[PDB]
Amino acid sequence: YHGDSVASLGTQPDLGSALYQENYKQMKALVNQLHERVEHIKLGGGEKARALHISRGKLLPRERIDNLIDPGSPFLELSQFAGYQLYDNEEVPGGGIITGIGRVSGVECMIIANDATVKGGAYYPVTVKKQLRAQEIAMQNRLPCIYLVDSGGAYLPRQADVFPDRDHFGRTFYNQAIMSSKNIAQIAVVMGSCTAGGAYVPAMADENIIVRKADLHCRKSGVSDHWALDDHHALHLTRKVVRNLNYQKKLDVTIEPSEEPLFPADELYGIVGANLKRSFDVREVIARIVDGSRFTEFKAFYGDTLVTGFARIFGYPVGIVGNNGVLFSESAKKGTHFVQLCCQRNIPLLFLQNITGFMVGREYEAEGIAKDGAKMVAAVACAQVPKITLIIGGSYGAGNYGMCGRAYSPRFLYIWPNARISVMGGEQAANVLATITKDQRAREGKQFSSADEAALKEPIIKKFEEEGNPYYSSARVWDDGIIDPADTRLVLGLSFSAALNAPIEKTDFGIFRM
Amino acid sequence: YHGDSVASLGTQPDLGSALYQENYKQMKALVNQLHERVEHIKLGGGEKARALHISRGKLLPRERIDNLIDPGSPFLELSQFAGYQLYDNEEVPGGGIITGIGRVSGVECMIIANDATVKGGAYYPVTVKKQLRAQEIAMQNRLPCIYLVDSGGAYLPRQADVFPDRDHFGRTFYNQAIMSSKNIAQIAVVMGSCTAGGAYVPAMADENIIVRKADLHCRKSGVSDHWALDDHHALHLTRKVVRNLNYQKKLDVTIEPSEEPLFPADELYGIVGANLKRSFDVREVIARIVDGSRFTEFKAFYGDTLVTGFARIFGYPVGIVGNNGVLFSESAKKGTHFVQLCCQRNIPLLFLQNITGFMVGREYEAEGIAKDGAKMVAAVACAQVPKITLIIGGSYGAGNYGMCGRAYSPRFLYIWPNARISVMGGEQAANVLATITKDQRAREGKQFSSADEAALKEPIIKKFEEEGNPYYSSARVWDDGIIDPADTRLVLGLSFSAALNAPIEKTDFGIFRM
Amino acid sequence: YHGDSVASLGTQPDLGSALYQENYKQMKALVNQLHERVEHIKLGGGEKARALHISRGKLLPRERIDNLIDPGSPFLELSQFAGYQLYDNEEVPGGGIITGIGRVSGVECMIIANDATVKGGAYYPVTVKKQLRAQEIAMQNRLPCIYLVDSGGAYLPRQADVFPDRDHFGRTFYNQAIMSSKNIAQIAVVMGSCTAGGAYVPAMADENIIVRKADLHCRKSGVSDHWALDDHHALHLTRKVVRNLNYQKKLDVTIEPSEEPLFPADELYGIVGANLKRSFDVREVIARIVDGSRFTEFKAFYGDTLVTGFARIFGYPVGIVGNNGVLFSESAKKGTHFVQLCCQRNIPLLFLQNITGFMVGREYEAEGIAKDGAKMVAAVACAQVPKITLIIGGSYGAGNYGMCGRAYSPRFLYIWPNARISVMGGEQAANVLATITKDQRAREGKQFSSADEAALKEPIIKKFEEEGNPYYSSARVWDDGIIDPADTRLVLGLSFSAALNAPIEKTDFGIFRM
Amino acid sequence: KAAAKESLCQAALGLILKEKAMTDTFTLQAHDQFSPFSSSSGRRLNISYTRNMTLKDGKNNVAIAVTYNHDGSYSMQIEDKTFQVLGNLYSEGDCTYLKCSVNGVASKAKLIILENTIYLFSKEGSIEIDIPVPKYLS
Ligand SMILES: CC(C)=CC(=O)SCCNC(=O)CCNC(=O)[C@H](O)C(C)(C)COP(=O)(O)OP(=O)(O)OC[C@@H]1O[C@H](n2cnc3c(N)ncnc32)[C@@H](O)[C@@H]1OP(=O)(O)O
Ligand SMILES: CC(C)=CC(=O)SCCNC(=O)CCNC(=O)[C@H](O)C(C)(C)COP(=O)(O)OP(=O)(O)OC[C@@H]1O[C@H](n2cnc3c(N)ncnc32)[C@@H](O)[C@@H]1OP(=O)(O)O
Numbered sequence A, B, C: 001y002h003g004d005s006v007a008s009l010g011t012q013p014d015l016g017s018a019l020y021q022e023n024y025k026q027m028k029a030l031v032n033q034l035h036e037r038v039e040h041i042k043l044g045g046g047e048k049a050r051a052l053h054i055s056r057g058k059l060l061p062r063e064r065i066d067n068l069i070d071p072g073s074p075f076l077e078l079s080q081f082a083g084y085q086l087y088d089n090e091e092v093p094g095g096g097i098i099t100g101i102g103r104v105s106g107v108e109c110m111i112i113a114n115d116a117t118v119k120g121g122a123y124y125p126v127t128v129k130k131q132l133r134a135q136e137i138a139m140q141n142r143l144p145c146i147y148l149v150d151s152g153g154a155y156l157p158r159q160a161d162v163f164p165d166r167d168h169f170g171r172t173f174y175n176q177a178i179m180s181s182k183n184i185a186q187i188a189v190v191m192g193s194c195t196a197g198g199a200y201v202p203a204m205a206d207e208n209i210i211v212r213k214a215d216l217h218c219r220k221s222g223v224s225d226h227w228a229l230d231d232h233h234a235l236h237l238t239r240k241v242v243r244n245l246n247y248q249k250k251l252d253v254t255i256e257p258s259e260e261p262l263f264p265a266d267e268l269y270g271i272v273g274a275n276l277k278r279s280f281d282v283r284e285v286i287a288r289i290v291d292g293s294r295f296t297e298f299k300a301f302y303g304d305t306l307v308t309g310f311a312r313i314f315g316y317p318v319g320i321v322g323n324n325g326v327l328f329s330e331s332a333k334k335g336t337h338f339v340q341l342c343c344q345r346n347i348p349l350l351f352l353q354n355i356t357g358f359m360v361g362r363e364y365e366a367e368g369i370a371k372d373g374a375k376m377v378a379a380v381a382c383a384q385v386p387k388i389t390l391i392i393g394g395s396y397g398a399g400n401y402g403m404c405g406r407a408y409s410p411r412f413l414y415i416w417p418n419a420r421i422s423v424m425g426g427e428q429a430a431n432v433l434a435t436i437t438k439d440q441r442a443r444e445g446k447q448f449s450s451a452d453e454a455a456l457k458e459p460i461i462k463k464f465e466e467e468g469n470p471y472y473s474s475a476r477v478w479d480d481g482i483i484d485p486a487d488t489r490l491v492l493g494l495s496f497s498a499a500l501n502a503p504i505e506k507t508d509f510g511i512f513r514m
Numbered sequence D: 001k002a003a004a005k006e007s008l009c010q011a012a013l014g015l016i017l018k019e020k021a022m023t024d025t026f027t028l029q030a031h032d033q034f035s036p037f038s039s040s041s042g043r044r045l046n047i048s049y050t051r052n053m054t055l056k057d058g059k060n061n062v063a064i065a066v067t068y069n070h071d072g073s074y075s076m077q078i079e080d081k082t083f084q085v086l087g088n089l090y091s092e093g094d095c096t097y098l099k100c101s102v103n104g105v106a107s108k109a110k111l112i113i114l115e116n117t118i119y120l121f122s123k124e125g126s127i128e129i130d131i132p133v134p135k136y137l138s
């Protein structure tokens, strides 16, 4: 029986409120800026290289993606902002590579396409990082990989950062071999010149498609498994190969009919705004994203600063954990309990981080908070269910670790355009450094002047402010993308769908330090 | 029956030869320089901080290691050169942390000790990398971890490189939790101040030892499992805890009595020298290191450029693969065959890299060499037996990948003081860039002057020369240490011994592209 | 998405061509002869024994099969030609036993029925071989076995070939026991006299049905589990028992709607003909049999002599491997690659053999061809996916091994009425023997005359010609039947359907000698 | 007479809707009935997705740029003109009928696609638009 009613979250916000108006203005401005920057990145390497690429008869990489995926299928691009102002004078749109998840012949696949326009498709260090992240995603979620190889090899002026180390270029080939061993299909499509150091990708792959115009490779080397007249033919052949994969999706979770949330998503703009100093109820966000705005809270009156519960997204079950204030002992214990419960029942986990800075409270007895957050950290680390993190606000200190940051391998991690990430708030770091130097130079009997205090403080403030920018964090691959809040639900759906390809296996826990 | 005789490798070198004299002089100079630099690093943070540390009553970290390990046991330190001239003006001896493998209570354990003298034990990015490498080694080889925590938290002026990303600070805790889940003992000894962000390490650990002089932690928090009067008492308690671990070493390989090599190891100095342009027979090295100088070559007359065979080191079986010239198709096929054979019989693998540069030969038809080296790369990547790499000469290009570089996760990787590592030789890269620019500006009709040719070439030459230095590569953690050749055998023994702690499991291979 | 179009094989043959007319005439004559011989075998032991059998009130074995299987279900009979002119003066139609696969109560089952008319149902050696082959098929494909026991025991005048050895009579009981242990149902129906040495079959079976008219067996011995009034009642009881088996078919491969081939099958008669000297494109056959004539070739321009690709038969996926000329190194490597690929994706394999004799080329450097065909042989042997072989032309030498001959345990093996199988061509063997004797008697100084050359040559030619006949090979159980080409598709469908009953398990490969 | 721009827009919409229908069938077979990937939305992150389609009218080739709006309507630009089209395909009797509004003008037709040709049957008449063969499928 599934007929009894359930209470729904969410309340209608006050559209007339001045606070709502101001928050809406600020967040809409941020989203417009994000959209403009994304368009500029989408334009690619430049009109020069684009005209040259077209004159050679080859398709532009975005056109390749469009023709490859199923007609009208949504495409989930990752890390559109890699390399954004990362290098001092060189502009590297999209990191020189395009990675995403899309449905080909009814199968979710991870597509990795080199962009020939950007520096002839050379490999900047950020490009290697992006590709490794994509391969890691595909390995974890058991997704076939399709490479659209139009490469130029390592960027020589930066070889020291691309070639030698463990997470450097060679790891790419390593991943390929491993994913072939675990029976995850590898398809390579040599749509560009087969330059030095590039033939390794087709040779490692399970199956190859090579566009006609090395010649020795198809006729004598035999590296070629298929031989295509041009780009369109190659993409069609790729679709045929994917069909011939003999794969069927196995899902192991209960499914229910999906239902839209009761409240419009754009209202989030008013609720969240751009000021981190003001706070908001995470329950509003949860009401905006989950199915039917139906939510079953767990331990509501204990550890109120954390909001844990169960819901459904597009019919899949999810356990939601979010911050609603300063984390405490009770909140940590509640989180550990909830994580154990979700792991036992094999339910995917969704974290929402809105870590609150310690500027409000001087001490907060970091020892006890640490003693309890350690338990939550261990529980999150040992979990095996799919985990997806979303940073809707500040993310500072060990709380970031506790709420499944990058170090804890969430299947995906996205940030809203108003997030901030750093070890601490800038002013707190300034005070810490000032106190350290003051105490030390007092210990040696040296005098500490207030001018020196300002001299230490100001650079730290500016540096922390600059490094906390979402664009700074997404230029490096610290997140899989910056998403417009109004689309959040949709993205999560796609992500969770992909995460369901892999089977869910049992969770083993370490010693629970009681 | 084990009585029939076996032929032994190695020949007596010509001590009177001028070439031998010169090579000996150069290599001995390199080793002396290495020893001097190691002594200076061993001195630690400085006399100032050392006196301050002693005045507080605490032991110096090296003394801690000496008292912790079994009396007279050899200690295998890793990455003594991390941070060597890595940061512009800050001197960070040993990376601010000391990691090694040593025998405690008859059990091989991985010991990680913070150095309080260096910047109060703060965590530079290189320190995080070193610690993560140590934890990875312990996880792979199934070794108990002992932490001697005297920490100061992240180095704030560099927070952007320490806190946020996947391989940044949080991964430490992640590793701890995981290694606790797989039943690998975690012991933490809080020998310093329990500052903010430090209590997480004791809280994550399985067992704790805390030196008396937080107080709340032992009496009320209950984080303390043991409570020690001072450093000596804490180390004794640690030995007792390790004994109480209830662990017994399980070995799954045949063992034979060990026998010393027939030739003195110091002769290597004469054989190898410091000039990479000259070449030498790897069989000399193999004769110098393996037991009794007994070696059973495999496919000796096919692919002569690669030397593959079987031997014993301290009684353990090893399969040895080394370069003796430019790698070719036949060499790659021989290597793939040998790797498959060793994986089938569960024998550890030892690689010796002496990759030869392509300055000698203009083309070397990179397509066929690539088509075959891809097979060797796949075979090496998919292997599951313990793999140890040693770089005795040049290491360039995809050959580095083929001979199990860092990207392919060897259990250990060491380099001799005369190695060079880079994507290509400097002059080759200069020629490549010059040709690219010349061809392009010819395409646009622009004129290319010889002055511009020199202007491009010289910086590239100097940069590649600088980046290839062993000290440059070991400052970053690209290798687990620079070893005196005269000690090589010994080191390998210890390493292989440690690698035998983990059980050897079956190897799964991808599609062998025939 | 499954909407994009695929190119189809096959071309309309030239019906007006004289070559087509002649080939059609010859092949139609062969098929008519085959049909006539099959009818004569179907007539059974003879009118004498048939009248005697009817007078006893028992049904004829073919009537038993007709009533047993589901109404209108197709029945796949195996080895209709066993014993055809095998013994000098004794005519043994069908080997004295009838084995086939048919659907009973919606379950594929292997039916084995003794023919009482032929020598009172005695067991000739060929009968034992046929029964063992049927039991092997059922074991491999996990099919319930139904025995219709009307036996007479071993044929005493030939006891030395029936009783003692491993593949002699006792192995029957062995198989029964084993197939009972692995939970494969054994049903025995004693429709004839329970003579000496026959009661073992009911006693070994899981369930029994005994026709009333030993009496002691049902009332006191208790061997009887069911007791039937006559043959019709016994068959009905058998259907009820099969229903009570509690079995459900588990399929683990993707299924698509089936579609008929685009070209008529009878055209094969014109394409293939009866002359092995002329050649034809195997792609014509593939177009005639696969679904929709859709085929996705793999490595089309490399090793053109072998044709490998993917297709669907009645909606199931199949990998097709066929000969189109003399096998070479590249062909062998392509075959090994394709076999690995199909094993990885768990796809059934279908081999078509048209091995070409070496009369065209004197040497063909057998050493290299052997060195490469060894790889293909190993790959085929180690494979675990269902394998079905079809011999559409010549089959000679090690090529037969390479294309999955009987020694390599294909689930089924059929031959067309125009095949030839032998170690070599007759003339080649004659030349080899002549050269051996000539060289030897030259070595001893004896003279070799041309009359002696003819004397050696002619008997060998005649003997090889006689032994290569399809009827000769099918008289012994070297194949599971001779099939009219026009029906080939249908047969394959049924066969593959049966092969899907067993689960497909992973393939383990030996050392790939690179 | 040469077919107008509007008929080409209607034909393009019909072909897209057919692709959506095949996607629906494949979704019906699969386990993951409610996966967002099965939608024919063409949604991209922070970008609007545009198809360059080629349709063959008479002896002249015409290129249509179809932008997938978030609302589900399609913005098709042929040459200079841009057209806003919203439509759906529904079965009248035994027959597929396309109802489509182009620039706010609603039209009803019978849509039959066999091989390359697309047949719009309406009161005004019948319009045949040919999908060019990839010419690698011969
Ligand atoms: C695996 C292992 C173990 C090792 C290796 O792989 S070692 C690989 C060595 N690489 C090559 O051997 C390829 C050398 N390229 C070429 O042969 C071509 O260039 C192509 C093939 C790239 C096509 O490119 P193209 O010829 O069609 O156009 P182009 O404009 O010339 O393309 C942009 C121009 O590339 C210049 N450029 C600068 N740095 C690099 C770089 N590292 N790689 C490529 N190009 C680079 C850029 O500065 C200029 O543009 P810019 O900056 O002047 O605007
Ligand atoms: C986990 C998460 C999620 C988050 C975190 O963990 S956020 C952690 C914040 N850290 C602290 O809150 C510890 C603040 N230290 C102190 O409270 C003390 O200092 C001790 C405890 C370190 C003992 O040291 P001590 O007091 O015995 O000696 P001191 O000489 O003072 O030691 C050297 C001096 O440390 C200065 N120094 C510069 N940068 C740092 C730094 N990042 N950390 C520590 N010290 C630093 C150095 O510049 C000077 O020496 P120098 O450069 O002048 O020669």
Ligand SMILES: CC(C)=CC(=O)SCCNC(=O)CCNC(=O)[C@H](O)C(C)(C)COP(=O)(O)OP(=O)(O)OC[C@@H]1O[C@H](n2cnc3c(N)ncnc32)[C@@H](O)[C@@H]1OP(=O)(O)O
Binding pocket: C119, C120, C121, C122, C151, C152, C153, C154, C155, C156, C157, C163, C169, C193, C195, C196, C197, C198
């Ligand atoms: C497992 C182990 C470890 C050991 C054993 O199993 S040791 C088994 C010993 N066998 C018996 O103990 C059965 C003895 N048969 C009989 O008791 C019956 O015969 C029946 C039961 C067969 C029914 O047959 P039936 O009685 O209805 O008709 P019949 O014409 O008589 O049938 C044909 C006639 O059988 C003659 N014939 C010749 N050789 C044999 C033979 N080897 N077995 C049977 N019959 C044979 C044939 O020559 C003549 O015909 P032909 O050649 O004259 O035309």
